[PDB]
Write a protein that binds this ligand. Structure first.
Ligand code: MET
Ligand code: MET
Ligand code: MET
Ligand code: NA
Ligand code: NA
Ligand code: NA
Ligand code: NA
Ligand code: NA
Ligand code: NA
Ligand code: NA
Ligand SMILES: [Zn+2]
Length: 870
């Protein structure tokens, strides 16, 4: 059932009965008890008898005044203060109390170490005061903060400092104003003691912006890369999208206790310190690139999110899909576009596709939501970005930029919908996107089937392409989509055959708009090898009967790097499926020599970009492998990935070592070419680790001990864990002894513990709940130990005895009361039960039923559990 008393429905959206135009807040801050005074200027738009319904959660109400009159015509109901008999225009004054120190959910105003900080997206501001906590209510904020000066020397909020003072009893105050109207999800406050990295950026039209990065005392050495990436973000948004920052100060605060990654609060972003702090001996290349991504992402929200915001939470993809697309384009333009595209596609096929088949399936613009924090999803974010990328593919850059400009010109200063965005793109480009809009309302992954025919008499190549989407748990009815289907045809020399029809050029993006259609190309002078769905031109599963030689030919000749990688993946997939079937019969790994040879050729190809080689030589993860099957056998998948690694290691031993030694770098630098060389080197080391044991142990221990950087040390440590080499325990103990007082660094070690293939991994993981560097109160530690076990150690999580499931239930029973958002993230592997065999399925079901009986089950878990048990 898509019918629930607690569910909200998109189709029920109505404009609010009241608006707020200006709000003046005062915080009398204290960790045990904070007093909030909120003075709002309000305007009734609806009927004279409609009351004002303000959202509020766990607030202690002290007083309510309307135009300075203490009010009697109100009542408190569950999650609301309902005020009747209001004039048309009035001043509302609310005083209420809250308690940051009791806030373990980390929603609203809470404590991160000694700091106080906020998280208001999506519906967190209602935990601070009674408000119209909905993003179509935009208001101008003024925020005054009063606090103990020794404990909270920095008092920050959105915008600029407009006033400040010193009081008796060691207190002081600062007031802030932000001139841009905003929804309350974008409000922020920080109070604490910090080191501050200060810099400036001058915008293209000459506006000077003060940049300020606040980090815990002692962490300034790990701040410069984030600062540099902020500057890069600003410069890039200017160059690519013509967008400049619109305020005088840009503040970022790094906090250790944060449920998500980061938050785009206007002028005052708040970041998980995971996505800020880096130095060469604490952070890997991938960490540096993630910091760049996330810094960029929150900056890009300043236009796609802040200057134009969301009419209601069902429109989340309006800002997230677009902003992810922007962070991907940023990463891609500065770094390796091919490697970016490859990794985004790995995430789509391996994690997103699984969600879109799960009980939690939803369209990128959802129709029904119980707990909005459950919809910060792979679908809304990653599939949302693929939908924007499809629009880009259909329109081309120049038309796409015209559409962006019309979107802002229409909607700057307001809350918009997905439909308003698509309409701006259509009106600016004159490309019809009516059919295309179905991508917003339909869930599930389309399956595109392609058959082909070559007619040597006429030199025609005919593609017959059909599509369908299977029913999903949320929708019984599906229809065809407007699928942009990019192709390239290759001749026997590896050259592109021009596409034509009736002696006229044809565009290489086919418009696959029907359940079935046929495309006929002329002057196809040789029987072509096709590259199909180039650059993953739509988020679909492809069914095409590839021969192994078509694939190996594409690996050698395809023009774009991505299609070379994509062909390698299709070549492995066949043999992954073969060998999972073999594993279930107790048979050894079987692989044809010609498949090993194709990978040999990549290793020895002198012209190939090392970043591309490295991705071709990174086997699909267990998640991407799971996509290939209707019923997942988690034990066979893990064992096949390991056996395939062992087999290629034996077969390619000499070549692996040679490429490993050739890519040795004496200097460490954070530069894309050097990163590419290192990623290839370490991909070779991974295979070598699974080869002959004595050489493995020597290469790995030596890389670890001689590393001048976390990238090379961690690649070695990870390989020792994964291949269970003799040096493993000693390297793990060394890392612990060196880094235990550094939580971000320890997260890597917890993930390696959690993902270990050793036989007693669950026992070791349970014992790590008492480790000196673990705490249940910190979301990063939880995700690194518990989340990695459940989500990335499928063979242990899915042990036949059900011990993995019980472990997760015990953890969830704690997190359901402590931090429901983290609990809901962690439950995800249990809700996939219908992908598994009957026996596993029945144990997963019993685990879910046990959680369903928790006293005070959170809405967050309830939504996922009821869908899963349906
Ligand atoms: C609701 S927290 C998510 C923060 C921000 N919208 C991001 O995209 O990372
Ligand atoms: C890959 S083009 C060839 C299509 C089909 N095998 C034919 O011979 O007509
Ligand atoms: C994943 S390393 C194996 C476990 C390690 N020896 C420990 O007990 O901490
Ligand atoms: Na308003
Ligand atoms: Na936003
Ligand atoms: Na690039
Ligand atoms: Na990768
Ligand atoms: Na249209
Ligand atoms: Na065919
Ligand atoms: Na593929
Ligand atoms: Zn975002």
């Amino acid at each position: 059932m898509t019918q629930q008393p607690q569910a909200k429905y998109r189709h029920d959206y109505r404009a609010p009965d009241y608006q707020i135009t200006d709000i003046d807040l005062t915080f009398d801050l204290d960790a045990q008890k904070t007093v909030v005074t909120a003075v709002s200027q309000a305007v009734r738009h609806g009927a004279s008898d409609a009351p004002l319904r303000l959202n509020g959660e766990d607030l202690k109400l002290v007083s309510v005044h309307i135009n300075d009159e203490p009010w009697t015509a109100w009542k408190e109901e569950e999650g609301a203060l309902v005020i009747s008999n209001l004039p048309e225009r009035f001043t509302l004054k609310i005083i209420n109390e809250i308690s940051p120190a009791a806030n373990t959910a980390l929603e609203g105003l809470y404590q991160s170490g000694d700091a106080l900080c906020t998280q208001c997206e999506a519906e967190g501001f209602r935990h601070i005061t009674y408000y119209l906590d909905r993003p179509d209510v935009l208001a101008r904020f003024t925020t005054k903060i009063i606090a103990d000066k020794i404990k909270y020397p920095f008092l920050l909020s959105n915008g600029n400092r407009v006033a400040q003072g010193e009081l008796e009893n060691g207190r002081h105050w600062v007031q802030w104003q932000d001139p841009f109207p905003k929804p309350c999800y974008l409000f922020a406050l920080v109070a604490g003691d910090f080191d501050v990295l200060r810099d400036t950026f001058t915008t293209r039209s000459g506006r000077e912006v003060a940049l300020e990065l606040y980090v815990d005392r002692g962490n300034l050495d790990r701040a410069p890369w984030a600062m540099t990436s902020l500057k890069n973000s600003m410069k890039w948004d200017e160059e690519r999208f013509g967008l400049e920052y619109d305020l005088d100060i840009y503040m970022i605060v790094a906090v250790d206790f944060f449920n998500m990654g980061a938050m785009e609060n206007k002028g005052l972003n708040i970041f998980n310190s995971k996505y800020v702090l880096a130095r060469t001996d604490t952070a890997t290349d991938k960490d540096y690139l993630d910091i760049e991504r996330v810094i960029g992402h929150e900056y890009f929200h300043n236009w796609t999110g802040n200057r134009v915001t969301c009419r209601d939470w069902f429109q989340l993809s309006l800002k997230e899909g677009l902003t992810v697309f922007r962070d991907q384009e940023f990463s891609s333009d500065l770094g390796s576009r091919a490697v970016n595209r490859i990794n985004n596609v790995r995430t789509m096929r391996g994690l997103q596709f699984a969600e879109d088949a799960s009980p939690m399936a939803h369209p990128i613009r959802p129709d029904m939501v119980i707990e909005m924090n459950n919809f910060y999803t792979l679908t809304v974010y990653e599939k949302g970005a693929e939908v924007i990328r499809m629009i880009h593919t259909l329109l081309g850059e120049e038309n796409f930029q015209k559409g962006m400009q019309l979107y802002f010109e229409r909607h700057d200063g307001s809350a918009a919908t997905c439909d308003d965005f698509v309409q701006a793109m259509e009106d600016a480009s004159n490309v019809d996107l009516s059919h295309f809009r179905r991508w917003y309302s339909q869930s599930g992954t389309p399956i595109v089937t392609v058959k082909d025919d070559y007619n040597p008499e006429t030199e025609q190549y005919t593609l017959t392409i059909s599509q369908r989407t299977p029913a999903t748990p949320d929708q019984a009815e599906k229809q065809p989509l407007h699928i942009p289907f990019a192709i390239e045809l290759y001749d026997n020399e590896g050259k592109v055959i021009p596409l034509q029809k009736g002696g006229h050029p044809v565009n290489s993006v086919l418009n696959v708009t029907q359940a079935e259609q046929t495309f006929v190309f002329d002057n196809v002078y040789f029987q072509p090898v096709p590259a199909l769905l180039c650059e993953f031109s739509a988020p679909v599963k492809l069914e095409y009967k590839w021969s192994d030689q078509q694939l190996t030919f594409l690996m050698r000749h395809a023009r774009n790097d991505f299609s070379r990688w994509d062909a390698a993946q299709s070549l492995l997939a066949t043999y992954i499926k073969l060998n999972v079937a073999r594993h279930q019969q107790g048979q050894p790994l079987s692989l044809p020599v010609h498949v090993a040879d194709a990978f040999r050729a990549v290793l020895l190809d002198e012209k190939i970009d090392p970043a591309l080689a490295a991705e071709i030589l990174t086997l699909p993860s267990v998640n991407e492998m799971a996509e290939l099957f209707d019923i997942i056998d988690p034990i066979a998948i893990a064992e096949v990935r390991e056996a395939l690694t062992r087999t290629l290691a034996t077969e390619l031993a000499d070549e692996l070592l040679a490429i490993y030694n050739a890519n040795y770098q004496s200097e460490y630098r954070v530069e894309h070419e050097d990163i590419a060389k290192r990623t290839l080197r370490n991909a070779c080391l991974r295979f070598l680790a699974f080869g002959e044991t004595h050489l493995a142990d020597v290469l790995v221990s030596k890389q670890f001990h001689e590393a001048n950087n976390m990238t090379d040390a961690l690649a070695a440590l990870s390989a020792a864990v994964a291949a269970q080499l003799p040096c493993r325990d000693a390297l793990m103990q060394e890392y612990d002894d060196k880094w235990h007082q550094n939580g971000l660094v320890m997260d890597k070690w917890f993930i390696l513990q959690a993902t270990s293939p050793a036989a007693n991994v669950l026992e070791t993981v349970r014992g790590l709940l008492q480790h000196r560097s673990f705490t249940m109160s910190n979301p990063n530690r939880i995700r690194s130990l518990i989340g990695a076990f459940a989500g990335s150690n499928p063979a242990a999580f899915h042990a036949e005895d059900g011990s993995g499931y019980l472990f997760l239930v015990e953890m969830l029973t704690d997190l359901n009361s402590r931090n429901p958002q983290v609990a809901s993230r962690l439950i995800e592997p249990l809700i996939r039960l219908k992908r598994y065999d009957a026996k596993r399925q029945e144990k997963m079901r019993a685990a879910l039923e046990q959680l369903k009986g928790l006293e005070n089950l959170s809405g967050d878990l309830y939504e996922k559990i009821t869908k899963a048990l349906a």
